[PDB]
Amino acid sequence: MENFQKVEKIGEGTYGVVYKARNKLTGEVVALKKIRVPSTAIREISLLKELNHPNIVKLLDVIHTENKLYLVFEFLHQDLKKFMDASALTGIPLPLIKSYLFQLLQGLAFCHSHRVLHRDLKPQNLLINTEGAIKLADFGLARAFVVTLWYRAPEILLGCKYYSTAVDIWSLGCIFAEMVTRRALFPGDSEIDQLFRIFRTLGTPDEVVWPGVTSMPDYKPSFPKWARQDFSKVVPPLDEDGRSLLSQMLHYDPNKRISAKAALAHPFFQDVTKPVPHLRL
Numbered sequence: 001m002e003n004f005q006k007v008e009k010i011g012e013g014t015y016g017v018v019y020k021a022r023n024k025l026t027g028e029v030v031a032l033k034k035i036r037v038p039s040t041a042i043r044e045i046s047l048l049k050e051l052n053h054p055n056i057v058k059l060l061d062v063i064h065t066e067n068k069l070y071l072v073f074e075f076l077h078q079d080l081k082k083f084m085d086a087s088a089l090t091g092i093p094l095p096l097i098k099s100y101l102f103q104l105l106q107g108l109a110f111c112h113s114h115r116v117l118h119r120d121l122k123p124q125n126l127l128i129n130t131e132g133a134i135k136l137a138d139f140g141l142a143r144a145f146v147v148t149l150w151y152r153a154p155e156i157l158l159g160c161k162y163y164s165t166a167v168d169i170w171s172l173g174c175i176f177a178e179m180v181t182r183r184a185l186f187p188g189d190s191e192i193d194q195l196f197r198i199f200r201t202l203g204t205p206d207e208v209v210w211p212g213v214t215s216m217p218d219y220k221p222s223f224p225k226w227a228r229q230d231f232s233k234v235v236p237p238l239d240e241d242g243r244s245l246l247s248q249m250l251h252y253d254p255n256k257r258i259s260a261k262a263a264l265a266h267p268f269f270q271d272v273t274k275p276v277p278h279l280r281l
């Protein structure tokens with residue numbers, strides 16, 4: 001669009017490139033996403049514009065010109081990944097971790113109530129500002145249409161084609177653990193490796209802990225049998241309230257995994273506050 005001046009490439013995505021750009025007709029700074037056009041996609045994207053919430057990156061406009069699609073979003077200066085790297089030596093203080101988690105759950109609860117899944121949550125999709133807020137980006141873009149498998153729910157890796165809102169809670173749980181320990185929970189480099197790293201930590205699932213798991217499309221009776229490890233070993237500094245919530249976010253059975261709404265009332269958030277982080281832009 002000749003109506004936008006590309007400032008710089010912010011990065012590539014699962015559905016296109018993202019640029020920081022200025023709207024020559026408004027002077028506004030925005031995030032321009034050039035998508036890499038089906039009618040359903042246009043309508044699916046159209047719904048996302050009505051999805052307004054303080055913890056969701058706002059979709060400002062949809063420009064469909066010359067059979068090409070560009071999405072205009074609000075712009076935030078930093079993603080959680082860069083923030084974690086910058087805090088690698090000291091770690092993110094618990095009060096801030098708690099604040100970010102609490103806000104993300106509010107965001108997810110809102111999206112889920114409208115039946116909008118993410119299905120691709122990860123640090124690069126979480127944006128923060130100088131105000132202490134954090135927002136979900138690239139929401140609901142999955143349905144409308146090497147990649148990291150570190151945050152993928154087990155039901156997805158096992159071939160379930162009708163996943164639910166529970167897949168986002170799983171990803172959030174992985175991110176939660178990563179902020180606390182400062183290291184990826186399940187850093188797999190292939191689908192099977194990802195699955196096995198999960199099994200080696202939470203134990204290989206069976207019919208007892210996950211009814212119907214052995215009927216999943218990609219389930220194999222030949223999977224190695226690993227025992228479950230203790231969470232005190234997995235996320236050390238995290239207190240009992242935190243470990244309790246994390247475990248409910250990482251239940252194998254999607255139906256027993258905690259929902260965003262229920263997680264918001266968990267004791268872990270009893271003392272939540274909204275600290276302002278020290279950001280270097």
Ligand SMILES: CNS(=O)(=O)c1ccc(N/C=C2\C(=O)Nc3ccccc32)cc1
Nearest residue numbers: 031073074075076077078079082137138
């Ligand atoms: C990786 N470098 S960084 O931290 O400087 C950095 C800076 C800005 C952004 N912003 C990205 C985005 C933004 O603001 N709005 C979006 C809507 C959809 C997808 C990505 C975005 C992401 C990362």
